[PDB]
Amino acid sequence: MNINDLKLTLSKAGQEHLLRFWNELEEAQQVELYAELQAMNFEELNFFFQKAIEGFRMEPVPREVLGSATRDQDQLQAWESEGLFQISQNKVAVLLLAGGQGTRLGVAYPKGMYDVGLPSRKTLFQIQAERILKLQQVAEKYYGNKCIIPWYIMTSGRTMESTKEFFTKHKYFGLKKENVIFFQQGMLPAMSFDGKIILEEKNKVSMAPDGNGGLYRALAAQNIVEDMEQRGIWSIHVYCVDNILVKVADPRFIGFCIQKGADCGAKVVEKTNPTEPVGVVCRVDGVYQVVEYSEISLATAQKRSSDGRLLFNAGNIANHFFTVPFLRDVVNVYEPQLQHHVAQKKIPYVDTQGQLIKPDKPNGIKMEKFVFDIFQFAKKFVVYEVLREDEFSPLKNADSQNGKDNPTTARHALMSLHHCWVLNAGGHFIDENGSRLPAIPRLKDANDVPIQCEISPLISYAGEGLESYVADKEFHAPLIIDENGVHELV
Amino acid sequence: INDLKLTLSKAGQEHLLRFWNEQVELYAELQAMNFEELNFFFQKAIEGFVDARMEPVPREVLGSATRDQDQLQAWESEGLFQISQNKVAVLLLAGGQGTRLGVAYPKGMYDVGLPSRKTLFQIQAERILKLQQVAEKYYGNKCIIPWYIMTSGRTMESTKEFFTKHKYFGLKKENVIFFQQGMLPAMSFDGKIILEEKNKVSMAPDGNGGLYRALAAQNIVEDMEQRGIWSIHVYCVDNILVKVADPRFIGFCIQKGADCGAKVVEKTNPTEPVGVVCRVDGVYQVVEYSEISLATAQKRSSDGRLLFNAGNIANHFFTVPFLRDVVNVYEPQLQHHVAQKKIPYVDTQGQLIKPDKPNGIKMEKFVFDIFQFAKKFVVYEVLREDEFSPLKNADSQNGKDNPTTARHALMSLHHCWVLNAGGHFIDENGSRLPAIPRLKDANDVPIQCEISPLISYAGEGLESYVADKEFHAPLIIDENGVHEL
Ligand SMILES: CC(=O)N[C@H]1[C@@H](OP(=O)(O)OP(=O)(O)OC[C@H]2O[C@@H](n3ccc(=O)[nH]c3=O)[C@H](O)[C@@H]2O)O[C@H](CO)[C@@H](O)[C@@H]1O
Ligand SMILES: CC(=O)N[C@H]1[C@@H](OP(=O)(O)OP(=O)(O)OC[C@H]2O[C@@H](n3ccc(=O)[nH]c3=O)[C@H](O)[C@@H]2O)O[C@H](CO)[C@@H](O)[C@@H]1O
């Protein structure tokens, strides 16, 4: 096997242009490109592209399959108890989707390492770790035994190394290294409209992660489902890394799904603005699915039911519940049926002249599978609705962009929530003279700021357990309550 | 000589002349303050330093643009007819002034960064011009919607200058009426008027409820009657989406026989800073966002919505006879709302300081505190994406209601109007773009679109401009036609 054999393989697949700069490359760059091309399956790539080019009504879910933290408040205690019981029996794991890479936030590292500016400065990864540690601790107190919630973390080619080092450096935030399982998802090449793979540099193919639905081939590639079975796990909480409010391994959502006998569940918040970028959960021809926000028509998005609400209001917050036997079937049977969603994009490339170009017009497509496309195969699907102020504030954009879902909105949503937890547990906030501040601040002058408050997950998972700390007392913000006590910063 | 000196003495405000022997303007201002009244206001306001009695808005007084869509045409027709008969005026509350946005001019002059660069004042003026034009086409006669603008001592001059410079944006000078609202001094917790400068008293506008005394001082109500106006649409200057003189809301109040109406949007987040309309002891009130308890704000009804979900967007309907009664009879009943403040001051020893802790309070009357006197009050609910995106904070602050959110809310709305009228947006290759874009890369931006009010007031009248056509954003549609930037 040499360059001659590779040239023939590429030419038979219509990709010989991938070696066009070979004679101009430094020897080290030829070694690199040769290795990369050798690891690609050009036949499969050609097939994916063909389907993508070829592949180039909705009804709300029935009320019988939808549960609501707000309208079904009378059942929360029973669901929470069932969820904590499962966690205590070591039957629950969580799986974090952290393979996304893109630079829209303007930084080079993965989003889980981002510091949105909380008083504690904790990154998303650390806040998530502390919620998992908190539940292991709470379950042990209500049942007596120690328990474990394994943390599977999916990374991509451009995040595996950095994510691993970050964790190593932080001593896995207090969890045991043997209970954090990193695995990488696959990558796919950008392709021009004509079917040719795009070179980003003279010696580098333009590659990107294969979508969060690439989760299923990644699980098969690293025998993850076998690992789950061997650990004796029944339930998997799959979730998105970018939401500072995510209730990792939420016992209420998990208990609800277990009690309903579901093999698949989706957590949602009410969509109220027609153009909000969230996919909507629904069914077509009796089969459940999510219609992504970029695939819905304005007429559909704006449609209203008789009560005044949007007809399609179950907004996907990328928090799902899957049982292990369902994932096993997905991985060994259904995966090939998941289709690639295609996006036209401006892909930086090197031109036939050897210069690096930033296209003024889309020059190719990106193919990706979506994690929620397996809902259609579930034997029993349920939906669980929660309030967005308690559970959903995503980090998608930089502050300098469109004005929403950015670090500023994220830190303020967490601080407003924790400020409410204190008020609800009987505490109050005061100004410098000790006069009581209102629940909603008058922000009238340039120096006025909202109340800054942050409670560590170790202290409170969702608002419980604060009365002994704050009932009948008043605090000067910024207020932090953590394992080292109560702290008023200056 | 010691005439004012004795005046201050009886009021216990003699300290205001502590830097006198160290003198003209400090006299002109000092002699325009009713010290007797100010002590009375302070005592009552500070006195003793409602939630349990709050009841939700009943369905009988609430109309909805969404739920009552079948009646919109009739309401819209009634409002346009009124406008055509010269029976409608608007009143802008533009006396507010603060350092929050970090600029030295009034909010009406703010340019939030739209493709046209228009200021809030200009957009509002064009919506007025637009309804005069539409009413003339439908009924045949030229008509007038007078524009009363309330300013404060810190906005009056700048405002007039700006309008003069812009030739009143196309409206006639005689139909734009400026008037100033009164002012109030900051006071220490012990009731002592605070001096900002050894020669200047710390002063601020007396709240938007200061509107009623302002109307009396300048005989504004008489002007309205002289013009034959029946309906007045009162509105806040900071909302880029405000439907000035909205025929639907005006038509709804007229048809319901109301003398007072409040437009609202559904409040869905318990801590959103909007006052909530409610009923207390049989009469309507707005409980301001800074006066509600968290328990009440968070309460939910059986259908899952907030129990107090009628969010005030500071857009009110008042009949002229009601305002007359308020100005001449009820006004004295309005109470002052208090807020502690860090007031920059010049204490003894001519020392100028910036308080590290609040050092006094400011008093304000609120415009909606007259709802309780209405003979027939109504509430009209609209969608926030069509009607409410306020400018309250600078971009560098808390992350909401800033120039960025305001410009994006107007452009998203106009982008929707184009789609709903049959137009399409395309990328550089001519492929059609989705209604909701995937924003994944550093350079991805939502569709920029801006339609001048002179072309479309609320999404109508666009068929001949965009139906079955494709456009490359930024797209601007104005009196000069369609422009692709
Ligand atoms: C496809 C999908 O899930 N869409 C949901 C996602 O949209 P959104 O537009 O965020 O979709 P993305 O696929 O980019 O990202 C979602 C998550 O998937 C991860 N990721 C993405 C690509 C990849 O190859 N590998 C990978 O692991 C990201 O790290 C993130 O954790 O969140 C929204 C809520 O905020 C939901 O309303 C959308 O329905
Ligand atoms: C008292 C009042 O109206 N509160 C409403 C105002 O609150 P908010 O606190 O946001 O607003 P402000 O009272 O400061 O200002 C409202 C309007 O009144 C004007 N103004 C203010 C003070 C003054 O002395 N003179 C004056 O003319 C401002 O120029 C602005 O046009 O808008 C919100 C919607 O965004 C509503 O939910 C609040 O219930």
Swiss-Prot record, chain A:
| Keyword annotations of the record | Cytoplasm, Immunity, Innate immunity, Nucleotidyltransferase, Transferase
Which principal EC class is assigned to this enzyme? Answer: transferase
Residues given in the record as UDP-N-acetyl-alpha-D-galactosamine 2 binding sites: 444
Please give the CDD domains that the UniProt record associates with this protein.
UDPGlcNAc_PPase (cd04193)
Expression tissues: Widely expressed. Expressed at low level in placenta, muscle and liver.
What outcome follows a substitution of residue 442 to A?
Decreased interaction with IRF3, leading to decreased pyrophosphorylation of IRF3
Q: Does the keyword Transport apply?
A: no
- Give the GO terms filed under biological process for this record: antiviral innate immune response; positive regulation of type I interferon production; UDP-N-acetylglucosamine biosynthetic process
Among SUPFAM superfamilies, the record links this protein to:
Nucleotide-diphospho-sugar transferases
Where does this protein hold UDP-N-acetyl-alpha-D-glucosamine 1?
97, 99-100, 185, 211-212, 240-241, 279, 292-293, 316, 370, 396
> Which catalytic reaction applies to this protein?
N-acetyl-alpha-D-galactosamine 1-phosphate + UTP + H(+) = UDP-N-acetyl-alpha-D-galactosamine + diphosphate; N-acetyl-alpha-D-glucosamine 1-phosphate + UTP + H(+) = UDP-N-acetyl-alpha-D-glucosamine + diphosphate; 5-diphospho-1D-myo-inositol 1,2,3,4,6-pentakisphosphate + O-phospho-L-seryl-[protein] = O-diphospho-L-seryl-[protein] + 1D-myo-inositol hexakisphosphate
- Which positions does UniProt annotate for UDP-N-acetyl-alpha-D-galactosamine 1 binding? 97, 99-100, 185, 211-212, 240-241, 279, 292-293, 316, 396
**In terms of one coarse class, where is the protein primarily found?**
cytoplasm
A GO molecular function annotation here is:
protein serine pyrophosphorylase activity
Q: What EC identifiers does the entry list?
A: 2.7.4.-, 2.7.7.83, 2.7.7.23
Subcellular localization: Cytoplasm, Cytosol
Tell me how this protein assembles: Monomer and homodimer.
Q: What does this protein do?
A: Catalyzes the last step in biosynthesis of uridine diphosphate-N-acetylglucosamine (UDP-GlcNAc) by converting UTP and glucosamine 1-phosphate (GlcNAc-1-P) to the sugar nucleotide. Also converts UTP and galactosamine 1-phosphate (GalNAc-1-P) into uridine diphosphate-N-acetylgalactosamine (UDP-GalNAc).
Per the record, the similarity remark reads: Belongs to the UDPGP type 1 family.
Name of the molecule in the record: UDP-N-acetylhexosamine pyrophosphorylase
Species of origin reads: Homo sapiens (Human)
* Lineage of the species this protein comes from: Eukaryota, Metazoa, Chordata, Craniata, Vertebrata
